[PDB]
Scaffold this motif. Structure first.
Motif, PDB file in Angstrom:
ATOM      1  N   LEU A   5       6.993  -0.857   4.020  1.00  0.00           N
ATOM      2  CA  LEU A   5       6.453  -1.148   2.528  1.00  0.00           C
ATOM      3  C   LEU A   5       7.672  -1.935   2.101  1.00  0.00           C
ATOM      4  O   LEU A   5       8.750  -1.598   1.993  1.00  0.00           O
ATOM      5  CB  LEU A   5       6.218   0.438   1.907  1.00  0.00           C
ATOM      6  N   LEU A  22       3.748  -4.108  -4.195  1.00  0.00           N
ATOM      7  CA  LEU A  22       3.831  -3.547  -3.034  1.00  0.00           C
ATOM      8  C   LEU A  22       3.606  -4.528  -1.937  1.00  0.00           C
ATOM      9  O   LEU A  22       2.322  -5.311  -2.188  1.00  0.00           O
ATOM     10  CB  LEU A  22       2.648  -2.380  -2.911  1.00  0.00           C
ATOM     11  N   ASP A  24       3.063  -5.249   2.822  1.00  0.00           N
ATOM     12  CA  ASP A  24       3.233  -5.129   4.056  1.00  0.00           C
ATOM     13  C   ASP A  24       4.231  -5.872   4.673  1.00  0.00           C
ATOM     14  O   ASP A  24       3.955  -7.328   4.584  1.00  0.00           O
ATOM     15  CB  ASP A  24       1.983  -5.249   4.742  1.00  0.00           C
ATOM     16  N   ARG A 107      -1.435  -1.494   5.614  1.00  0.00           N
ATOM     17  CA  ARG A 107      -1.174  -0.571   4.529  1.00  0.00           C
ATOM     18  C   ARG A 107      -2.438  -0.495   3.451  1.00  0.00           C
ATOM     19  O   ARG A 107      -3.202  -1.443   3.414  1.00  0.00           O
ATOM     20  CB  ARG A 107       0.144  -0.652   3.777  1.00  0.00           C
ATOM     21  N   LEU A 126      -0.261   5.944  -2.102  1.00  0.00           N
ATOM     22  CA  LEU A 126       0.029   5.150  -0.814  1.00  0.00           C
ATOM     23  C   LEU A 126      -0.595   6.080   0.368  1.00  0.00           C
ATOM     24  O   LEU A 126      -0.701   7.275   0.522  1.00  0.00           O
ATOM     25  CB  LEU A 126       1.401   5.285  -0.653  1.00  0.00           C
TER      26      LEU A 126
END
Ligand SMILES: [Fe+3]
Length: 348
Positions: A5, A22, A24, A107, A126
């Motif tokens: 992350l 956020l 990947d 993610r 998450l």
């Protein structure tokens, strides 16, 4: 590593809003939670410097305190707009319901419906449940207010207890606002120590607390809410310009070489450099950085100014000095004379 992350918390001083980037780490695909309109250039520049592809902006709810940047980022870099279906907002690309996944690379965030502050609030969890973004539902040792936007303190209590306090105790909780310099809380902390609805406090204790806050009238609600019900529907044009995350306007060097006479080139190096082996750009005017502040009367107010130095640093500070002197069309040459020579570009 792999599919780790990438996380950034960004604060908007005007509204005290937190925006969360956020991504990947492998695929570089990103989401941005609660972007603020005034910070759209900042957010976009950060996404570029981190080399990310923004797939979605996600709004936790219809904000009353600021206009979302969702619309403007969609226009500028093509991110899709996501908001809850229960918000009633128009013009989104995706309407989120309880249980939906917002995916980015391998993610994802899962949506939990957490109304109470408004009827359309959601909490984003998450994938591995190590953090969750609670919007204005649960704040750090507090909650969002419940007196506008169809808020309801009974509903808030049930959402916090039923959707947030059921997460793992070590799960971090990132709120949409904080007014005290705090950045994060956790499920275990709030379960125990939240003074409005933690510990053994029951729903009636919480609603009595909320009834007697008597907060001032929300100062922006009459502008912000109609704008956000359309997802945020309401720049320097003298050259191809880009603003760095640091805040410096940078000119495109290919354009500059093809348009040298449209601008005044101010070289802020020292005299030995100006006359040195790096050469200089045709018609560059030497005003060394330590003299510039006192010599701005020599610059014209009729053409834009491009500052140049050895490698782009001193010329960035020159843009700051020129803006502080009232020059509004100013840009830095990124990479300076080193990069100009490295690319074989014309010199005197
Ligand atoms: Fe809010």
């Amino acid at each position: 590593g792999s599919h780790m992350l990438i996380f950034r918390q960004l604060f908007d001083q005007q509204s005290s809003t937190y925006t969360y980037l956020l991504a990947d780490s492998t695929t570089r695909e990103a989401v941005l939670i609660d972007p603020v309109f005034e910070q759209v250039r900042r957010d976009a520049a950060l996404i570029e410097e981190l080399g990310l592809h923004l797939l979605y902006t996600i709004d936790t709810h219809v904000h009353a305190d600021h206009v979302t940047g969702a619309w403007m980022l969609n226009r500028r870099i093509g991110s899709r707009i996501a908001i809850s279906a229960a918000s009633g907002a128009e013009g989104a690309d995706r309407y989120l319901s309880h249980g939906d996944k917002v995916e980015f690379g391998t993610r994802y965030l899962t949506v939990r419906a957490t109304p109470g502050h408004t009827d359309g609030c959601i909490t984003l969890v998450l994938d591995n449940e190590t953090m969750a973004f609670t919007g204005d539902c649960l704040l750090i040792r507090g909650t969002g207010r419940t007196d506008f936007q169809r808020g309801d303190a009974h509903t808030m209590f049930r959402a916090v207890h039923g959707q947030i306090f059921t997460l793992p105790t070590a799960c971090l909780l990132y709120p949409a606002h904080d007014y005290r310099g705090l950045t994060v809380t956790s499920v275990g902390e709030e379960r125990r120590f939240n003074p409005r609805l933690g510990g053994e406090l029951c729903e009636e204790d919480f609603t009595g607390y909320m009834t007697n806050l008597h907060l001032p009238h929300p100062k922006q609600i009459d502008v912000a809410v109609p704008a956000n019900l359309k997802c945020g529907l309401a720049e320097p044009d003298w050259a191809p310009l880009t603003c760095s995350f640091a805040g410096i306007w940078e000119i495109n060097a290919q354009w500059l070489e093809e348009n040298l006479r449209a601008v005044e080139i101010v070289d802020v190096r020292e005299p030995e450099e100006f006359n040195g082996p790096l050469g200089r750009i045709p018609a560059a005017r030497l005003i060394s950085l330590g003299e510039l502040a006192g010599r701005t009367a020599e610059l014209t107010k009729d053409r834009p100014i491009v500052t140049v130095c050895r490698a782009g640093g001193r010329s960035a500070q020159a843009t700051v000095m020129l803006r502080q002197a009232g020059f509004e069309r100013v840009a830095n040459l990124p990479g300076g004379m080193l990069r100009w020579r490295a690319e074989g570009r014309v010199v005197e």
